[PDB]
Amino acid sequence: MENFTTNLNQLARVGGIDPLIGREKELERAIQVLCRRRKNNPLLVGESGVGKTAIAEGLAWRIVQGDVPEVMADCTIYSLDIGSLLAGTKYRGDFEKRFKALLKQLEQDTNSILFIDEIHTIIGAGAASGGQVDAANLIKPLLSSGKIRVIGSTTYQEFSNIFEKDRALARRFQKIDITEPSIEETVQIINGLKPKYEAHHDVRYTAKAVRAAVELAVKYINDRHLPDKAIDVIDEAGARARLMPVSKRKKTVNVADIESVVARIARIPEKSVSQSDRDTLKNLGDRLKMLVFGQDKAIEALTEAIKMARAGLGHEHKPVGSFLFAGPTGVGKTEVTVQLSKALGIELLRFDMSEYMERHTVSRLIGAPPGYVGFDQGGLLTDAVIKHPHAVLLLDEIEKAHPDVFNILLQVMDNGTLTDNNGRKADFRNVVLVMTTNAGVRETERKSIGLIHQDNSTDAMEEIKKIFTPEFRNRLDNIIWFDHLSTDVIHQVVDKFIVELQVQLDQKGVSLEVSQEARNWLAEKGYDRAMGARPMARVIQDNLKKPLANELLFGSLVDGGQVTVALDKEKNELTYGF
Amino acid sequence: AAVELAVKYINDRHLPDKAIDVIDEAGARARLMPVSKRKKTVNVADIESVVARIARIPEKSVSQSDRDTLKNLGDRLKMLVFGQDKAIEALTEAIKMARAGLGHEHKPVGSFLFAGPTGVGKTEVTVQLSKALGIELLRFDMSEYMERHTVSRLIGAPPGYVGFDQGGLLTDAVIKHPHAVLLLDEIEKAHPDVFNILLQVMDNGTLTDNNGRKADFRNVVLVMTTNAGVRETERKSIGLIHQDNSTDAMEEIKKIFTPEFRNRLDNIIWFDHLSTDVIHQVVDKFIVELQVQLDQKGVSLEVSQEARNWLAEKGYDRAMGARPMARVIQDNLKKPLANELLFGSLVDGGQVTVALDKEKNELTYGF
Amino acid sequence: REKELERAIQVLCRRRKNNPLLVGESGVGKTAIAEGLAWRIVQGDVPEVMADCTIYSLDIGSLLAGTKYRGDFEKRFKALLKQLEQDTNSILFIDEIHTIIGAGAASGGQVDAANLIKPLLSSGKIRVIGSTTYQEFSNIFEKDRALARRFQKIDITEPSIEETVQIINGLKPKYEAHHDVRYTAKAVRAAVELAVKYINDRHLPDKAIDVIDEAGARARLMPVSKRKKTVNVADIESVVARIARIPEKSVSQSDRDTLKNLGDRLKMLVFGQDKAIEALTEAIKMARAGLGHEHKPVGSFLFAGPTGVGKTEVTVQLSKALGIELLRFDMSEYMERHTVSRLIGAPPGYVGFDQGGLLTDAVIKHPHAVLLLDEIEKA
Ligand SMILES: Nc1ncnc2c1ncn2[C@@H]1O[C@H](COP(=O)(O)OP(=O)(O)OP(=O)(O)O)[C@@H](O)[C@H]1O
Ligand SMILES: Nc1ncnc2c1ncn2[C@@H]1O[C@H](COP(=O)(O)OP(=O)(O)OP(=O)(O)O)[C@@H](O)[C@H]1O
Ligand SMILES: Nc1ncnc2c1ncn2[C@@H]1O[C@H](COP(=O)(O)OP(=O)(O)OP(=O)(O)O)[C@@H](O)[C@H]1O
Ligand SMILES: Nc1ncnc2c1ncn2[C@@H]1O[C@H](COP(=O)(O)OP(=O)(O)OP(=O)(O)O)[C@@H](O)[C@H]1O
């Protein structure tokens, strides 16, 4: 035992193991179990990071501090490192001699408790031959006879998958469920532990820093439990603050440092909103109007959703915003979204919904159910939002997906979550959801029969309503109708496309000038309300790019020249040059 | 009592030692009593306390603060969910019976199907119930169980398969939290094979997982929500008089959930549409949420009564429930505030006054 | 990678569970950073807190190698940890840290490297820097919750274009030394820009570097015939083009005439329908000229008409004339809605999941190709 276990009273008394705060009921049972006539061995079972070891060792602390029932007073708790019982072995029989020697020592002390953490690891030692499991074979009678007292500890999952197969062991200890504290209990736990962080990091925490670490961690960090989750924030903020005095920036850790740390851990930005990001955001609405012409209202809706979220007036558990972009083809429905993600500097997660035409294609978004082929793959959607929690999520031509696929978004739009096939949750609260569609267009573009042409603008009233179930629609922030582009827009579109052409040419060392007459001509020639801005690229392709490709490819316009294009008036034909 | 209670509440061990353990812990417990110098014998009440602790169930509520918490549970919920009183009452009645002891031998605390128009707090009330009671909410978006084979994610892969150690997500959630509110959202979206899992739960309080262990739902409140019948509810009839289609919505529910399912529910509660009175309450609720969000930035907010009356009058839509009201709040209050909070006077300001004129019915703003 | 290290240091500086885990896509510099810190410590490019501390890199294979008998592994494992605990100013670094979870427990037991490490991380006794990909982190580290709680995940993203150029400028001298080459400024900038435009299934820090290394390696085989030269933008372009399959610079050579005469080689084979020939010929020329569509296909043209008029023959002849692969897809075989899974594959969990997807594999194998969809109206 001398070099296999740790005397926890000795440790708790001299170095300290950090105080245990609260957990009155947890200890009440542990003691009542330890006080039983037989099988007086509690097992602390729970979610990782809830204080299972904190309690098991915390008991040693209470004993050395005298804060125990006299029954427990003066008893010694020893923690066993089973790794050391194997490190000292090699051939047959040495393990058992060593293992039993420790048991004899516990029996001889008579007033001691052994603590075995990771209790599910006591299964082992036997190998090659085996059948002698250690875990049960060397201790079943020790536990059932009351000769020794053992406190164990385990993760709830390990407990059911491993620590629960051996019924004989399952029967020999009393399980105590350690659940995670609530907000207040977490705050008091921090206050009790706080002096150790302040002492370790040479920092001090404000009342708000502590209050906030708990509330913020709960809201933003969701893969850990409260008592160790809020601590990471406090400890991390401490470690960060400790790196300031290096430039003499000695300071108290305040709520501002906590928010910076939570924001970094959760990858959700929070303080830059007060800095230059105010202008990046302020100007967002206009940068996008230089890329998508017309459609200002779509730009505003996106811009507004983002501003509210950055302002802090977002929702508590919804995507940044979620609206469907409907309209005629070639009007900037996907273009504004692509540009939004560029303007914001964030990842664009683009899915083509045309690929999800069968009901069973949902498995590509979620992953196969356990037990199936594609299980370890995970889901493509849930994974995309996990790697990039701050993103623009674009679902192109959503009306092409099998309609049951839309059901996947009900919980996304409403709770910001989606659960993958491993049970992990996607978190969409920092994702802008944009879905585009051509629903209703075929109808809006149809001519009616009669003397008076009917106004078919109520496409929203039929196709959008028939396609998207009421519960889907009632979760959208908006349904935004993109219009056909006007001729004023076409002129802007043509200018835009010519610039794109100029850039491709600049990269080849040549440049292009187009006269205004030539531009107006191309705009006038290509406009077709029905196809939006889509054909303008073809008009440019035929009137400017084809001529240029011949000049670029066969030597007429290569190194040494530039091309000027002008329109004549007689034929309205374009000129070219060098 | 140790013997007859252990067989009812402790189900992972055989009786000899299972009952002795109750006796032994009760013994140890009583042994730790005369430290206060109060000598004890072990009565039925001490046995019941031990079983309650071993089985992870509630003991006796009348002398507890739980008595008061339970007594006015309906009142607190009515402050969060307006209207739909009958749903609130059904939930609290089932709970009271269970704590009263007038429960079921082997069934969930109660089992309800929440049906009705959208935007009505079918989900909202369940979420608040778990908060009001202080217990874990176990959620399961049923839209994610659309294929016959998705059942294995609820109960785990069969042994020997790639998803065998993961276990089931449902049985594990229940095992970890035996006393909980279990919410199954949009249950009608799940593949019907899923309902077969629910039928046995509703009748026995239990599911066997892929490890052969059982989840005990005896202390779980089971609420599942649905939109079955909504498209029909919102349909307008042909004629001069619009018809009440709630009767057809039920026909839709009865086609999705077969008699075998329906007979295992304690109730099917058809939630009604929200009234204008409710909207006024809803608007105040949303404004308060806004005020809280603003307080977090150090900004106070006043909204006049007329501004409230107007927002409520503007946003009400009987068919869409309360969800649109939040849209009204975003456009009339949050957007203006975001600009002031982000680029203007409220950054280090801290105050905003909102009222409207009568001539334009436009809102005021500013520090 | 200043911020990536700032966080790593802040994690190492924590009181407990001060073990950063570097998680990211492959080829993004995760291990470059962990080794980079050892480099910075030695060079004095780190806070005094890290200064003078030793980072050791663990060979899991040598730790497990030879551990026969019951107890040798456990002994070696513990000896290592003891040595680290007695150093007091060291950090252990583990590549592919998810593999520690698979350390050899001898038999049916659970005593292995992860179970033996856990208490020393919780206690703050030792410091470990881990490294794993987002996929290995998800399928391995994410599952062992207790171990995962002892690491602080650092999210390492792919660098920008400007950042990639800068790492090349820093790394460059070693490629120059290794290959006996020198790289021009244009060569470096282009490796990054071109790799971004043309090389898929890789991340920048690696993608640009791979081009620099190969181009250096190409030039390394020139002064064997004493064709000594530097690596210019043209050489970088050639290397990327090897992968991209359509060079932007060779278009200026004999390729100009191969392309110029394309229209006539096709007119002599397909008669009438000159307009189809022109449509195809022009699309290619623009694409080779550089007047492409940035992200769209070379061109997409529906050929409609009476039978026996050369609609598929001209496309077949095009692929022949160009010297490129013809990918054929008979649309009549996709006569039903569900037949789409033949083109892209079955969803995960379904029979045939690992069979592939005919269209996506055809295109992936042959990036430069003519894709012909016969009788599209029959799909
Ligand atoms: N009363 C408490 N005493 C000590 N620690 C507590 C307490 N309550 C919560 N904690 C938190 O839990 C941790 C205490 O250590 P503990 O051994 O209990 O972890 P754990 O719950 O067993 O997690 P794991 O399964 O990974 O070992 C600390 O992060 C601490 O912030
Ligand atoms: N308002 C606009 N300003 C400038 N260019 C535009 C505009 N609208 C469309 N375009 C042009 O069309 C493209 C933008 O993509 P767009 O949003 O129109 O796709 P879409 O609306 O989804 O149509 P589809 O039905 O084919 O998917 C760009 O090439 C862009 O030059
Ligand atoms: N009776 C109510 N009182 C106040 N707010 C309500 C009420 N009912 C609904 N709401 C509003 O709805 C919001 C939550 O939506 P809810 O949970 O009710 O949708 P649902 O019941 O699931 O219906 P569906 O999903 O079919 O659209 C609440 O935050 C609340 O603002
Ligand atoms: N314009 C042409 N000039 C010379 N030969 C030709 C022409 N068209 C077709 N042919 C010949 O006739 C045969 C059929 O040609 P092809 O398959 O390309 O026509 P198609 O448009 O595909 O008809 P289908 O409607 O059946 O698909 C080929 O062997 C081809 O050599």
Side-chain angles (χ1 to χ4, degrees):
Chain A
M1 187 176 284
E2 297 85 359
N3 289 337
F4 302 108
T5 65
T6 298
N7 182 329
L8 296 175
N9 287 349
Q10 186 62 31
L11 179 61
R13 185 182 301 109
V14 176
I17 58 167
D18 296 343
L20 180 68
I21 295 94
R23 291 298 196 185
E24 297 83 358
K25 298 301 289 179
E26 289 72 9
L27 289 170
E28 182 181 1
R29 291 198 74 197
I31 294 167
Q32 289 172 352
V33 172
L34 289 167
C35 296
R36 291 182 39 186
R37 184 177 177 267
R38 296 290 183 269
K39 302 181 297 196
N40 54 329
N41 305 299
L43 177 65
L44 309 182
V45 181
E47 297 277 18
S48 297
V50 299
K52 293 185 272 86
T53 312
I55 294 166
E57 293 183 343
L59 179 59
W61 177 84
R62 288 181 183 274
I63 293 167
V64 300
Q65 298 297 302
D67 192 12
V68 298
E70 68 289 351
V71 175
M72 292 303 294
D74 302 324
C75 81
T76 300
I77 303 168
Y78 294 90
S79 174
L80 174 64
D81 182 343
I82 65 171
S84 296
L85 298 177
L86 299 175
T89 67
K90 293 179 179 179
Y91 298 85
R92 181 188 64 199
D94 55 5
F95 176 75
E96 292 77 11
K97 287 191 286 182
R98 171 180 289 111
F99 188 91
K100 290 175 81 72
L102 269 66
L103 293 174
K104 289 177 183 178
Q105 289 174 304
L106 290 170
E107 291 180 57
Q108 290 169 348
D109 286 344
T110 78
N111 197 24
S112 64
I113 301 167
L114 188 71
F115 172 58
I116 301 173
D117 200 343
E118 303 267 342
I119 198 67
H120 69 104
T121 64
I122 64 170
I123 297 167
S129 65
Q132 299 296 306
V133 174
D134 176 0
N137 289 113
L138 300 175
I139 61 171
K140 285 178 195 180
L142 271 293
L143 299 174
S144 67
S145 67
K147 287 178 179 180
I148 62 173
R149 297 191 293 182
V150 180
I151 298 166
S153 177
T154 184
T155 304
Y156 217 140
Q157 182 179 31
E158 292 162 355
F159 175 73
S160 69
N161 283 342
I162 314 155
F163 189 84
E164 274 225 336
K165 298 183 71 68
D166 183 333
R167 293 284 180 269
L169 289 172
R171 191 181 66 77
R172 283 165 168 72
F173 293 70
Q174 188 70 49
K175 180 166 73 59
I176 301 170
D177 293 297
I178 306 303
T179 65
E180 80 183 318
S182 187
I183 296 295
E184 292 76 13
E185 289 96 352
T186 301
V187 171
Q188 287 93 51
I189 292 165
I190 292 167
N191 286 338
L193 296 173
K194 176 175 69 165
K196 296 303 295 285
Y197 290 96
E198 291 180 334
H200 185 73
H201 294 294
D202 199 37
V203 302
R204 182 171 65 84
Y205 296 85
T206 66
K208 296 298 185 182
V210 172
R211 187 55 195 209
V214 175
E215 291 183 4
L216 292 168
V218 172
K219 185 172 181 178
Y220 299 113
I221 300 168
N222 289 337
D223 57 352
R224 273 99 187 270
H225 299 282
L226 269 67
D228 165 278
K229 179 163 75 180
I231 301 301
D232 285 350
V233 173
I234 293 296
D235 188 17
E236 179 136 356
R240 176 177 172 275
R242 182 161 66 85
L243 290 188
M244 305 287 109
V246 303
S247 299
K248 302 185 182 178
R249 295 170 292 179
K250 176 72 173 183
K251 71 187 307 296
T252 300
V253 176
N254 209 337
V255 68
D257 293 292
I258 296 300
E259 286 181 354
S260 180
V261 171
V262 173
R264 186 174 68 192
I265 292 167
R267 299 184 292 156
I268 302 172
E270 177 57 34
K271 295 296 187 185
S272 67
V273 72
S274 296
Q275 299 177 338
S276 68
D277 199 60
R278 290 184 186 279
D279 294 297
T280 298
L281 181 59
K282 182 170 72 187
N283 295 334
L284 177 61
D286 295 324
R287 289 193 301 278
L288 294 172
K289 293 171 186 168
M290 292 189 280
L291 300 174
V292 177
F293 303 121
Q295 265 65 281
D296 289 343
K297 69 183 185 288
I299 293 168
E300 290 170 349
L302 291 168
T303 302
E304 287 305 328
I306 294 166
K307 287 189 293 188
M308 289 187 284
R310 296 299 292 146
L313 305 180
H315 191 275
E316 295 297 312
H317 49 79
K318 293 179 179 179
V320 171
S322 161
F323 29 62
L324 173 82
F325 291 173
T329 180
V331 299
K333 293 183 292 189
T334 65
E335 186 55 15
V336 72
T337 301
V338 171
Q339 294 303 336
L340 177 64
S341 72
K342 290 179 181 289
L344 295 172
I346 62 175
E347 190 70 20
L348 177 66
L349 307 174
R350 183 195 210 153
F351 294 83
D352 293 305
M353 294 295 105
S354 68
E355 298 179 9
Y356 303 85
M357 289 188 281
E358 302 92 56
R359 293 182 75 232
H360 64 112
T361 61
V362 170
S363 294
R364 289 177 66 193
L365 299 172
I366 303 302
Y372 292 79
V373 56
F375 178 70
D376 181 65
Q377 184 184 61
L380 298 175
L381 176 59
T382 57
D383 190 61
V385 293
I386 293 169
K387 292 189 292 185
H388 302 285
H390 185 195
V392 179
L393 175 63
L394 172 62
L395 309 181
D396 279 354
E397 311 280 325
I398 194 167
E399 83 265 23
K400 302 299 187 187
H402 188 285
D404 287 341
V405 174
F406 298 164
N407 292 336
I408 293 300
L409 298 174
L410 293 171
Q411 65 269 34
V412 174
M413 290 188 287
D414 197 30
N415 299 283
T417 68
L418 181 66
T419 301
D420 169 86
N421 63 347
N422 292 125
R424 61 176 65 82
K425 295 180 186 290
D427 184 347
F428 296 81
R429 291 178 293 171
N430 293 284
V431 176
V432 180
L433 173 64
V434 179
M435 301 171 279
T436 66
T437 183
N438 279 296
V441 174
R442 188 175 183 84
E443 181 63 30
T444 206
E445 309 282 342
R446 171 184 72 94
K447 297 293 186 183
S448 64
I449 304 170
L451 294 172
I452 298 173
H453 286 305
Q454 295 178 28
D455 181 316
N456 293 324
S457 67
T458 61
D459 50 0
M461 291 180 68
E462 295 186 14
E463 290 297 307
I464 297 297
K465 288 176 74 176
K466 290 175 183 178
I467 294 167
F468 297 96
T469 184
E471 60 264 19
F472 182 93
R473 286 187 274 105
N474 202 31
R475 287 163 166 67
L476 297 172
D477 291 302
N478 210 345
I479 300 170
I480 298 170
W481 278 105
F482 285 50
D483 293 317
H484 297 81
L485 304 182
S486 69
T487 58
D488 294 341
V489 170
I490 296 299
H491 290 293
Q492 291 175 302
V493 170
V494 171
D495 289 343
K496 181 182 180 182
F497 283 136
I498 292 168
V499 171
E500 291 178 357
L501 176 57
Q502 289 175 316
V503 173
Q504 290 176 332
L505 290 169
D506 288 343
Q507 292 175 354
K508 300 295 181 178
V510 301
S511 68
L512 170 67
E513 179 178 359
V514 179
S515 72
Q516 187 62 44
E517 293 75 16
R519 293 182 183 174
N520 291 345
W521 177 81
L522 291 169
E524 291 164 354
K525 179 175 172 64
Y527 176 65
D528 182 357
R529 187 172 180 272
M531 297 293 104
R534 181 55 45 75
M536 295 312 299
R538 288 192 289 271
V539 171
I540 291 168
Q541 186 182 52
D542 289 301
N543 290 282
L544 300 178
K545 291 179 179 174
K546 287 179 186 176
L548 292 167
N550 285 340
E551 288 182 342
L552 293 167
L553 293 170
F554 306 121
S556 295
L557 184 67
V558 298
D559 298 347
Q562 301 87 44
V563 51
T564 300
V565 178
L567 189 72
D568 72 17
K569 302 297 189 294
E570 295 77 7
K571 300 182 288 291
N572 296 300
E573 285 304 327
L574 300 177
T575 66
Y576 303 90
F578 180 93
Chain B
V3 176
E4 69 191 353
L5 295 172
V7 298
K8 181 172 181 178
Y9 305 102
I10 302 168
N11 289 284
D12 289 345
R13 303 183 177 183
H14 298 82
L15 183 60
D17 74 313
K18 179 169 77 181
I20 293 166
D21 288 348
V22 174
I23 294 297
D24 191 19
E25 181 177 310
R29 175 173 177 273
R31 181 265 177 277
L32 295 171
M33 288 299 291
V35 301
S36 65
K37 309 297 188 286
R38 297 178 292 171
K39 177 71 180 177
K40 300 291 181 185
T41 63
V42 179
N43 207 333
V44 171
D46 296 296
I47 296 298
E48 288 171 345
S49 185
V50 171
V51 172
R53 268 194 312 288
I54 293 168
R56 305 174 71 199
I57 61 174
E59 186 180 338
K60 302 289 182 178
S61 65
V62 172
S63 65
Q64 301 299 310
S65 66
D66 289 354
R67 184 266 309 284
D68 299 313
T69 299
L70 183 58
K71 185 176 179 181
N72 61 0
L73 179 60
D75 291 341
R76 288 191 300 280
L77 292 171
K78 289 178 181 180
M79 297 174 198
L80 300 175
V81 177
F82 303 120
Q84 311 302 344
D85 289 341
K86 68 184 183 181
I88 293 168
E89 291 167 354
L91 290 168
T92 61
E93 289 167 350
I95 294 167
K96 287 174 183 173
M97 290 178 195
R99 295 299 302 276
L102 303 179
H104 304 284
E105 294 77 11
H106 50 80
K107 296 186 76 177
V109 170
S111 178
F112 300 97
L113 177 64
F114 281 16
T118 57
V120 178
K122 294 185 288 188
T123 300
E124 183 65 13
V125 72
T126 301
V127 173
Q128 294 304 333
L129 177 64
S130 73
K131 289 181 182 291
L133 294 171
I135 62 175
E136 191 71 18
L137 177 66
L138 306 178
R139 214 171 177 158
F140 288 94
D141 293 307
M142 299 307 293
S143 66
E144 307 174 356
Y145 302 81
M146 292 189 286
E147 300 94 61
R148 294 195 56 219
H149 66 108
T150 62
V151 170
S152 72
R153 73 194 288 193
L154 294 171
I155 62 171
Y161 294 88
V162 70
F164 176 70
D165 289 345
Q166 178 169 298
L169 297 175
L170 177 60
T171 63
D172 196 64
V174 173
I175 291 167
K176 289 190 290 194
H177 311 274
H179 186 194
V181 179
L182 174 61
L183 170 62
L184 308 178
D185 280 318
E186 320 268 354
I187 190 62
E188 82 265 24
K189 297 297 197 283
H191 190 284
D193 286 358
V194 172
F195 298 170
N196 294 338
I197 297 301
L198 294 174
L199 291 171
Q200 73 182 79
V201 172
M202 291 189 287
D203 238 48
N204 298 318
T206 185
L207 297 173
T208 306
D209 66 359
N210 65 346
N211 288 292
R213 292 181 295 103
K214 294 181 179 178
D216 289 345
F217 293 77
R218 265 192 294 200
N219 289 282
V220 175
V221 179
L222 174 62
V223 179
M224 61 193 80
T225 66
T226 183
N227 289 337
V230 171
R231 188 179 291 276
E232 178 59 8
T233 298
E234 293 180 5
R235 184 175 64 84
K236 295 179 182 178
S237 64
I238 302 168
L240 296 172
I241 298 173
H242 290 311
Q243 295 175 25
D244 181 341
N245 293 324
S246 65
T247 180
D248 296 302
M250 287 304 301
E251 293 299 314
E252 295 302 320
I253 290 167
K254 292 189 290 186
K255 291 176 182 178
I256 294 166
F257 302 98
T258 60
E260 304 97 299
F261 192 92
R262 287 187 272 108
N263 230 359
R264 282 162 172 78
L265 296 171
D266 290 297
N267 204 353
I268 301 171
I269 299 173
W270 180 267
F271 286 48
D272 207 351
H273 290 264
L274 304 184
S275 70
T276 57
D277 294 340
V278 170
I279 296 301
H280 288 290
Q281 291 176 295
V282 171
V283 171
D284 287 342
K285 176 180 169 174
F286 286 125
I287 292 168
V288 170
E289 291 177 357
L290 175 58
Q291 289 173 308
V292 172
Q293 290 179 334
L294 290 168
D295 287 344
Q296 292 292 304
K297 299 296 189 185
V299 179
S300 68
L301 171 67
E302 178 182 358
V303 179
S304 72
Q305 184 61 44
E306 184 62 10
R308 287 176 162 79
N309 291 338
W310 175 78
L311 292 168
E313 291 163 358
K314 179 176 173 65
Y316 179 63
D317 182 354
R318 187 172 181 272
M320 294 291 102
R323 287 180 185 276
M325 296 313 300
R327 294 193 179 83
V328 171
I329 297 299
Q330 289 175 34
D331 286 299
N332 291 282
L333 301 178
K334 291 177 176 175
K335 288 178 186 176
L337 289 165
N339 285 334
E340 290 180 345
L341 292 168
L342 294 170
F343 312 119
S345 66
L346 296 174
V347 170
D348 294 315
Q351 178 179 268
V352 182
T353 300
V354 178
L356 56 85
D357 71 10
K358 300 294 290 192
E359 293 177 350
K360 304 190 296 298
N361 296 300
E362 296 291 340
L363 297 174
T364 65
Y365 303 94
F367 182 73
Chain C
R1 297 294 194 185
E2 297 83 357
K3 298 299 287 182
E4 295 302 320
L5 289 173
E6 179 182 353
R7 187 172 181 198
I9 277 53
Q10 289 169 6
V11 173
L12 291 167
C13 293
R14 292 188 38 172
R15 192 174 77 89
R16 293 177 66 182
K17 299 185 301 87
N18 54 329
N19 306 294
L21 175 64
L22 305 183
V23 181
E25 295 85 357
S26 64
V28 299
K30 297 186 294 300
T31 63
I33 293 165
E35 291 182 348
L37 180 58
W39 182 87
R40 287 178 177 268
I41 292 167
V42 170
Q43 300 303 307
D45 292 320
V46 306
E48 293 177 350
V49 175
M50 292 296 102
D52 305 323
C53 84
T54 298
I55 302 170
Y56 295 94
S57 174
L58 176 64
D59 182 334
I60 296 299
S62 73
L63 185 58
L64 294 173
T67 57
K68 183 178 179 180
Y69 296 88
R70 190 270 306 282
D72 193 71
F73 170 70
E74 298 75 6
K75 183 176 179 179
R76 291 177 184 194
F77 198 74
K78 292 294 293 189
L80 173 60
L81 295 173
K82 183 175 179 181
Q83 289 173 304
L84 293 169
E85 183 178 2
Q86 297 299 304
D87 185 290
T88 79
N89 195 25
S90 65
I91 302 167
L92 184 68
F93 169 69
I94 302 172
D95 284 305
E96 295 85 357
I97 193 168
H98 57 278
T99 64
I100 69 171
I101 293 166
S107 66
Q110 287 72 50
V111 179
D112 64 38
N115 283 332
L116 295 170
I117 198 69
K118 286 173 182 173
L120 301 179
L121 301 178
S122 295
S123 68
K125 287 177 180 179
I126 62 174
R127 297 186 295 185
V128 179
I129 298 168
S131 176
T132 188
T133 65
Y134 244 136
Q135 296 78 5
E136 294 295 293
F137 173 89
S138 181
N139 285 337
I140 301 171
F141 246 91
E142 184 72 9
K143 291 181 183 182
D144 289 345
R145 299 294 182 187
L147 185 62
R149 246 211 56 248
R150 289 156 170 76
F151 288 88
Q152 301 294 310
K153 181 163 70 67
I154 299 176
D155 188 17
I156 299 168
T157 64
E158 25 175 305
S160 73
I161 294 169
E162 297 77 11
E163 289 175 310
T164 302
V165 171
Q166 291 170 352
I167 71 170
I168 293 167
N169 287 337
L171 294 167
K172 175 178 70 165
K174 294 183 76 176
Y175 286 98
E176 289 184 342
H178 187 82
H179 294 296
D180 198 34
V181 302
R182 299 291 182 274
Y183 299 84
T184 67
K186 290 179 180 178
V188 172
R189 182 72 183 196
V192 176
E193 291 172 353
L194 291 169
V196 176
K197 185 171 179 176
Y198 299 111
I199 299 171
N200 297 319
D201 297 338
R202 295 289 188 277
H203 298 278
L204 274 164
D206 188 70
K207 272 197 311 189
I209 278 50
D210 190 56
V211 173
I212 293 297
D213 190 19
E214 180 178 329
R218 179 63 51 77
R220 176 63 183 82
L221 298 176
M222 295 299 103
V224 300
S225 298
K226 307 301 183 187
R227 298 170 294 183
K228 180 72 172 181
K229 64 185 293 300
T230 63
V231 179
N232 206 356
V233 69
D235 294 297
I236 294 297
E237 205 282 322
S238 180
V239 170
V240 172
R242 184 181 62 73
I243 297 165
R245 273 71 174 183
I246 304 176
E248 296 184 10
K249 302 297 185 183
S250 70
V251 73
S252 68
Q253 298 174 333
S254 67
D255 199 53
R256 289 180 185 277
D257 295 298
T258 299
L259 180 59
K260 184 168 69 186
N261 293 324
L262 179 61
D264 294 302
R265 289 193 300 276
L266 295 172
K267 288 178 183 182
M268 75 186 183
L269 300 175
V270 177
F271 305 124
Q273 275 68 276
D274 288 344
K275 67 176 85 166
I277 294 168
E278 290 169 351
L280 294 169
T281 302
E282 291 297 329
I284 294 166
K285 284 190 293 188
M286 288 185 280
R288 296 302 312 282
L291 303 179
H293 297 285
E294 297 300 309
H295 58 271
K296 299 175 70 171
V298 171
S300 169
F301 317 83
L302 178 65
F303 290 175
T307 64
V309 299
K311 288 187 260 70
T312 60
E313 187 63 22
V314 70
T315 61
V316 172
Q317 293 302 334
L318 178 64
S319 74
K320 289 178 177 178
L322 295 172
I324 63 175
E325 191 72 21
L326 177 67
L327 306 177
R328 209 153 178 167
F329 285 96
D330 182 359
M331 295 298 104
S332 68
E333 294 179 8
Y334 304 89
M335 80 294 292
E336 280 293 347
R337 183 183 175 93
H338 61 292
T339 62
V340 171
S341 67
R342 290 179 69 200
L343 297 170
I344 60 172
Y350 287 84
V351 66
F353 169 70
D354 184 1
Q355 191 268 321
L358 295 171
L359 179 58
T360 56
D361 284 338
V363 174
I364 291 167
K365 288 182 180 179
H366 302 285
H368 184 194
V370 178
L371 175 62
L372 173 63
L373 309 182
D374 285 351
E375 327 266 3
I376 191 64
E377 80 266 25
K378 296 183 191 287

